[PDB]
User: What shape does this take?
Amino acid sequence: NLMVCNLAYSGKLEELKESILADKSLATRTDQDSRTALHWACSAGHTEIVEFLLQLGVPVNDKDDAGWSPLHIAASAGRDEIVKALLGKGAQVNAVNQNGCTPLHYAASKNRHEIAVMLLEGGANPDAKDHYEATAMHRAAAKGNLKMIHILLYYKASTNIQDTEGNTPLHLACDEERVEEAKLLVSQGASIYIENKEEKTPLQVAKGGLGLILKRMVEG
Amino acid sequence: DIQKQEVREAVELPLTHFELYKQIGIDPPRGVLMYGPPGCGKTMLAKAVAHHTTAAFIRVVGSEFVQKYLGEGPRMVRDVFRLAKENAPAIIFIDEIDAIATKRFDAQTGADREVQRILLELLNQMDGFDQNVNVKVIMATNRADTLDPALLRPGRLDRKIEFPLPDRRQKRLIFSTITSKMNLSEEVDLEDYVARPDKISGADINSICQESGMLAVRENRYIVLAKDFEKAYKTV
Amino acid sequence: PKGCLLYGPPGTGKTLLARAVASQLDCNFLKVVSSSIVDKYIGESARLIREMFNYARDHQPCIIFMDEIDAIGGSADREIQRTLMELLNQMDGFDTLHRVKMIMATNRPDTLDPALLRPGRLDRKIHIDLPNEQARLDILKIHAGPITKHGEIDYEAIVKLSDGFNGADLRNVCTEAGMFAIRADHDFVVQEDFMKAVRKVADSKKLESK
Assistant: This one.
């Protein structure tokens, strides 16, 4: 609602750079959402603007009223150069937002391979949990991103994380009927004997006899 | 997705618009039953069918022929069936047969019995009109208890599609089709907003997104965020 | 003008004018509560404002009073701002407003949401201020009508000795002196009870004029 929202949203480069070089108050202006020009500039996809802000050394630990750091939000945007500059500065790779989802869940949600390799390369937890007790393989394996699963296999990601209901990534792969992904995770160590609060094995969660061929992938 | 997939396979394959069916008889069926315990459902499905199949659609409510003249039924099957077999193959949306599928005996409120005797009339008409007709009448409901064995006879309703409670597929793809047109944010995330409906049951997720648009058109915030998604979840 | 603002910072006096014409005909009646926003139950009062003002849209003539609007001029204030957005998107909304009318009243013009004070919506505003020696004399001559007086008439000491008031405080104080004239149960009413009783009772209203 402020000026830095339209200058940082509607595509103002020289008016915003002149606004920063003219008065630092506009550069450090916060709105009712507890956001700075970095949040709106990452919202509009401004590369050079956040390169100037991160160049001058803007505090990246600035969060909103919920706890959303620009690495969770901009990593939830799936932009290449934005995450290259944020990880170039070295932001908190394992900070907690309102729901607890680390930026790995957001790099895995948007199927961003380079953002996942660069987040997991800088020291991010490959098996971090949110408030819902779920990791990035529940959602990454549930959405249907096989290459994201493979690059999680590059970083030694666990396959038997218990959800808040008790489900595993194999339960979120059989519920979505991901054949090749459930065969891969089962061929990597997914236990077909883990039961959730519904008292149902992954053999009973899958449809069309897929738990029988997953058991075939267990015994063979 | 899977429901529109079974309906689509059960509709467009018999309606391939070839004259060779008239020689060897109408083998494939024409009636498809549906389900769905959200807010009466059965609307955005026919909306997507209207997006894909740019043809005629007889949009009628389930309680449209309850007029005291009792002649609206035969006039709609006569005129609508004759313009379907005569003009072009259409999709007649005769939905909500649960209110008109309940047994009734007393002649005081026996209007439902009279219109189910009209359902017997057209029930025999559709048997007499099994050959040489380009008609596709869909008929769905959302209750499996007030049904009668007459409608469940083979050759009339040959498909029985069920609907799951969370049904994460239609939820994810309805989020994709609601975010493909309306505005969105980078903070907007669907992970817990499609995983939580798997744990807790609900309805009208699209209308909940529209409620989030109502809480976002307040002009106090420029871009919708997740607080209106979760707040719209806890309110409605 | 589709909206008016009535701010009597000293005392009051708008309620007897809106009550004068509104009590006369008003052509209709519709009242909005100043505390109709607290909403102990779920925050779904917006559809009931759409229903109430939708009935106001159903009636072709309509005059709506919003007395003491400075309370909402400040999730306590969140739903207050939601009803304010109902005011914005229902005054500048989509409806034929060639016949409807509404009147907004307040107490102090300091906390009246200067974002709402933007013109166009609040077209009319009348500031009732210190005695200009004309409005107090007119309102005094029209309030002296129904009350009886003696041959001796005086008004300069009444307009001069009563300051910081309006026709409301002058009505309660003049009618108070008239109630002293019925406490004297005579067959005439000299203005001595008006000078001394309006003087002393007016001073008491200056002491309790907060």
The longest helix of chain C spans residues 167-182. Chain C has seven helices and four strands. The interface with chain B takes residues 42-44, 81-82, 85 of chain C (CB under 8 Å). The radius of gyration of chain C is 21 Å.
